[PDB]
Design a protein around this ligand. Structure first.
Ligand SMILES: Cc1cc2nc3c(=O)[nH]c(=O)nc-3n(C[C@H](O)[C@H](O)[C@H](O)COP(=O)(O)OP(=O)(O)OC[C@H]3O[C@@H](n4cnc5c(N)ncnc54)[C@H](O)[C@@H]3O)c2cc1C
Ligand SMILES: Cc1cc2nc3c(=O)[nH]c(=O)nc-3n(C[C@H](O)[C@H](O)[C@H](O)COP(=O)(O)OP(=O)(O)OC[C@H]3O[C@@H](n4cnc5c(N)ncnc54)[C@H](O)[C@@H]3O)c2cc1C
Length: 428
């Protein structure tokens, strides 16, 4: 048959489930990418960094296609409407299903349009490491132990034929949306594999100053490499593989509990009276809070669109349990900066930290203790907080006692706040 494959979040030609079936089931396959205005224009949850990474990855994907006497066929508009106008005469349409409300309804509409035109619509599982039917767990540890026993499908690629549509635009069109690139990523599968092979001490992955994180999230989220590939390449590293499974967990959690997008996983907490002091929130986004480690984190994130998991949760903790600001505010702000923004993964993590999610205990961290343990030399802090650039570490770790020039002193006492926020939770 003459069919179409629509890329979305699986920006690669290797080990792409839906693409594989498409290549083996039809004679010619037209590789398509649809620039959707609901995602690229006036998206409150849009990240400029994430977009650049996607565009760059889309540019790289286009090269791989040209090396096969084809090219990426680009269209513009809402997915369902695009299919409707341009593909009404194609045989079938292949894709990889996703798990968010937006994605689910978008595919339902494409399905309707497909039935009323005689186009076969085939969606396949690809983003997850495990089959979705296998989910039915309260917490992560329960999930991992049960599902990790299952065998991960091995990467594979089918041979086929890539065709083109003269009408369609080409990747050049997408350059309008690439406005500001992360100095820390370049996108594409080639960079992805390079990162996948750096040998780091994952053991010390908590220390920001060190370089022990693979920085693979954006590549996994946008699919320059498959979940299965990351898995087999690192199969021997238990720590990394278990963390890889956290992606599946949060995705599936959201898939089976759509209400997380807008409400608390544990609904009762939808009654918390967030102080939401717009003033503190503004200080948090600018990294002008009085805590060095928190300031360093936000500042890095702002200019880079990335921060390791340790800083990520310290920052999230501080906004929710110390400045007492609704986690949804932080969720949205992050969605705005993360080069690796993933709706379900971002949501899952925020709720976890705000303890309105999968973690049922009311977890608390000591900013100063934390700061001093994971950045003993204050190297990370000095790298991102301009003003403390020359203050000796010893002082920085106690900067609440002093008051260096140009650096605001703590905007609140975390201890008193955390106690109040908790009482407010128990109150509920
Ligand atoms: C900034 C960005 C732009 C992208 N543009 C395209 C594109 O043009 N074409 C394409 O095929 N794929 C695009 N992608 C890839 C996208 O991840 C896949 O298309 C995916 O299948 C779509 O579902 P999503 O939930 O990730 O949509 P996303 O782009 O995250 O979001 C789509 C819609 O959901 C809203 N939304 C996102 N997060 C939240 C939240 N936490 N709470 C409430 N609402 C939220 C957005 O505002 C928008 O209205 C883009 C991804 C990002 C992060
Ligand atoms: C408040 C908060 C928001 C977050 N938002 C996102 C997000 O929007 N998109 C996203 O991809 N990750 C998010 N995470 C998870 C995690 O921080 C990032 O995946 C990680 O920092 C990416 O950098 P890395 O690849 O170097 O991770 P490293 O530790 O090198 O690699 C570990 C890998 O395991 C997985 N992983 C590790 N921690 C988590 C986690 N907590 N949740 C899910 N998967 C994990 C990822 O594949 C990650 O690449 C968030 C975490 C927190 C606490």
């Amino acid at each position: 048959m003459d069919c179409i494959f629509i890329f979305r979040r699986d920006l690669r030609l290797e080990d792409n489930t839906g693409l594989n079936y498409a290549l083996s089931e039809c004679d010619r396959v037209i590789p398509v990418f649809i620039a959707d205005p609901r995602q690229l224009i006036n998206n409150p949850y849009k990240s400029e960094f994430a977009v650049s990474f996607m565009i760059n990855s889309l540019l790289e994907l286009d090269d791989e296609l040209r090396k096969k006497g084809s090219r990426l066929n680009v269209f513009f508009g809402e997915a369902e409407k695009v299919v409707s106008r341009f593909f009404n005469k194609v045989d079938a349409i292949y894709v990889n299903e996703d798990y968010t409300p937006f994605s689910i309804s978008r595919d339902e509409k494409i399905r309707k349009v497909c039935e009323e035109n005689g186009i076969e619509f085939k969606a396949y599982e690809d983003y997850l490491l495990t089959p979705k039917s296998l989910f039915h767990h309260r917490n992560f540890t329960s999930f991992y132990n049960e599902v990790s026993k299952v065998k991960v499908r091995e990467p594979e690629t089918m041979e086929g034929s890539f065709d083109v549509t003269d009408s369609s635009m080409n990747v050049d069109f997408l350059l309008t949306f690439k406005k500001i690139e992360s100095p820390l990523f370049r996108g594409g599968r080639r960079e992805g594999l390079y990162l996948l092979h750096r040998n780091v001490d994952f053991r010390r992955r908590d220390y920001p100053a060190e370089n022990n994180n693979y920085r693979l999230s954006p590549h996994l989220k946008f699919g320059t490499i498959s979940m299965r590939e990351a898995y087999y390449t690192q199969k021997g590293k238990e720590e990394f593989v278990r963390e890889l499974y956290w992606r599946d967990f949060f995705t599936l959690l959201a898939y089976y509990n759509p209400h997380v997008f807008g409400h608390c996983y544990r609904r009762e907490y939808d009654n918390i009276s967030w102080e939401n002091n717009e003033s503190y929130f503004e200080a948090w986004k600018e990294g002008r809070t009085g805590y060095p480690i928190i300031d360093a984190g936000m500042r890095m994130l702002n200019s880079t669109g990335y921060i390791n998991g340790r800083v990520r949760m310290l920052v999230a903790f501080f906004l929710v349990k110390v400045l007492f600001v609704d986690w949804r505010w932080g969720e949205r702000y992050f969605a705005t900066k993360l080069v690796d923004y993933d709706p379900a993964i971002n949501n899952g993590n925020w709720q976890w930290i705000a303890s309105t999610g999968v973690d049922y205990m009311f977890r608390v961290f000591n900013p100063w203790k934390q700061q001093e343990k994971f950045d003993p030399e204050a190297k990370f802090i000095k790298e991102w907080v301009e003003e403390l650039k020359d203050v000796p570490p010893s002082i920085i770790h106690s900067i609440y006692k002093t008051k260096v020039p140009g650096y605001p002193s703590p905007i609140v006492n975390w201890l008193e706040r955390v106690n109040y926020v908790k009482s407010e939770y128990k109150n509920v």
